[PDB]
């Protein structure tokens, strides 16, 4: 009645996403917000194509993302569950056992509201990985992971329930 110890679940990484069109310097202003929280330099993703509704024009930086892992991942995500009152919508868990939530106010995460830094909403998405997934990413011997070892959303909701005592 014991699972193999490699069958545990680990938070491989957390992505942090903003989408401030491009405005005049807004993407740079979100860079400051991401830098303090993750202690990392957020990389500016770029707009693809030029569309009418938003102001992206095939070259405006439209979003900033940093991927945080390990101890930083636990604390940044734990913040995100407290501010989301330990409640998450049930459908957030996805097919590959990846789930996300929305974070109003870069300030609500304990950052001080600033006249200089205007409120910027961000969103999160946490990727759950079963030890042994290296077979999918190694430069040599790159082969797809087997069915059992892939995290099914039901199994991951159980790891989220066990990890943060959340409710849906």
């Amino acid at each position: 009645e014991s699972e193999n110890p490699m069958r545990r679940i680990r938070i491989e990484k957390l992505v942090l996403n903003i989408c401030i069109g491009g405005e005049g310097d807004a993407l740079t202003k979100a860079a400051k917000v991401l830098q303090q929280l993750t202690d990392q330099e957020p990389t500016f993703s770029k707009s693809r194509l030029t569309i009418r509704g938003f102001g992206i024009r095939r070259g405006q930086k439209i979003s900033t993302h940093v991927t945080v892992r390990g101890e930083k991942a636990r604390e940044i995500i734990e913040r995100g569950l407290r501010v989301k009152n330990f409640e998450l919508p049930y459908s957030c868990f996805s097919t590959t056992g990846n789930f996300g939530f929305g974070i109003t106010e870069h300030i609500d995460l304990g950052i001080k509201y600033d006249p200089s830094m205007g409120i910027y909403g961000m969103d999160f998405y946490v990727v759950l990985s079963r030890p042994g997934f290296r077979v999918n990413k190694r430069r040599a011997q790159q082969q797809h992971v087997g069915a059992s070892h892939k995290i099914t959303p039901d199994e991951a909701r159980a790891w989220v329930e066990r990890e943060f005592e959340v409710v849906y």
């Binding site: 430069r139 040599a140 011997q141 790159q142 082969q143």
Partner: protein
């Protein structure tokens, strides 16, 4: 909301299976092509690729020549052979690569030399006598009459990161005598200004381990127990690493001849294929499971 399936019989019919090695991902076909394109004029004259594969517990060096079917592994030396040569632990560090290289090179020069049984090969090409970091290109000097056996380098699919283990295995073959085309910029200590004999003289001597071992004991002895457990039981203290490397290199160069070690061929159960007449029966029983119910 209910969608199309990617694996249609159409997709499968058009699937072009890659080469068995390409699908497995062990061999990059493009590099193999350029390393093995002998110019046609020469013909039969063979071409040697010095494979230096890397593995979790072993570093494998073998000099190979690709014939139309076989790859003709000529002479081979692996990391697991090094404890016999006196290095009990650290069988996959940078220093152990520069030993794996001497192990292969000196075996190749002697194996060709004993067949030659004349004034040729190792006496003509002792190579650098000791392990030192100075730039040494074997064929760059006299290279009189019999030329140094030159084999081109096969990094495999591993990435050429500055001073990776595979670069230091090449130096080991070069120390042995085999000319392997090289520039040493990749080797650590090659600032564009110059090549540091020191950066090599210390890494070749396994002093990378020495700094960590001594520091680990001071900051956290308990971690140093778990991290370097084999080193402690073996009794190779950080100070002793330099002596171990010099002795092993000396033994490797003088007596390369390998000795056969026995292998037990264990057979796994390998439950064999169900017989075809029985194979139809399994469906026949299932048919009853649906009909009678």
């Amino acid at each position: 909301g209910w969608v199309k399936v990617q694996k249609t019989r159409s997709y499968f019919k058009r699937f072009q299976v890659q080469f068995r090695r390409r699908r497995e991902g062990k061999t990059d076909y493009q590099a193999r092509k350029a390393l093995i394109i002998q110019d046609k004029n020469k013909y039969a004259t063979p071409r040697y690729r010095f494979v230096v594969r890397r593995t979790n517990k072993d570093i494998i060096c073998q000099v190979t020549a690709a014939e139309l079917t076989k790859d003709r592994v000529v002479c081979a030396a692996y990391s697991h052979e090094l404890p016999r040569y006196g290095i009990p632990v650290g069988l996959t560090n940078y220093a152990a690569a520069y030993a794996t290289g001497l192990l292969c090179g000196r075996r190749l020069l002697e194996k060709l030399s004993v067949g030659i049984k004349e004034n040729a090969l190792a006496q003509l090409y002792p190579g650098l006598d000791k392990a030192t970091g100075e730039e040494y290109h074997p064929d760059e000097n006299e290279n009189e009459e019999v030329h140094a056996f030159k084999a081109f380098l096969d990094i495999g699919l591993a990435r050429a990161s500055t001073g990776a283990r595979v670069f230091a295995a090449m130096k080991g073959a070069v120390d042995a005598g085999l000319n392997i085309p090289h520039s040493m910029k990749r080797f650590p200590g090659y600032s564009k200004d110059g090549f540091d004999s020191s950066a090599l003289r210390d890494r070749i001597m396994g002093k990378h381990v020495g700094d960590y071992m001594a520091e680990l004991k001071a900051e956290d002895e308990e971690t140093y127990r778990k991290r370097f457990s084999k080193y402690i039981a073996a009794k190779v203290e950080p100070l002793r690493l330099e002596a171990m490397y010099t002795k092993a290199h000396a033994a490797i160069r003088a007596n390369p001849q390998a000795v056969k070690a026995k292998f037990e061929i264990k057979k796994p159960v390998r439950q064999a294929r169900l017989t075809l007449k029985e194979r139809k029966e399994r469906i026949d029983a299932k048919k009853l499971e649906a009909l009678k119910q």
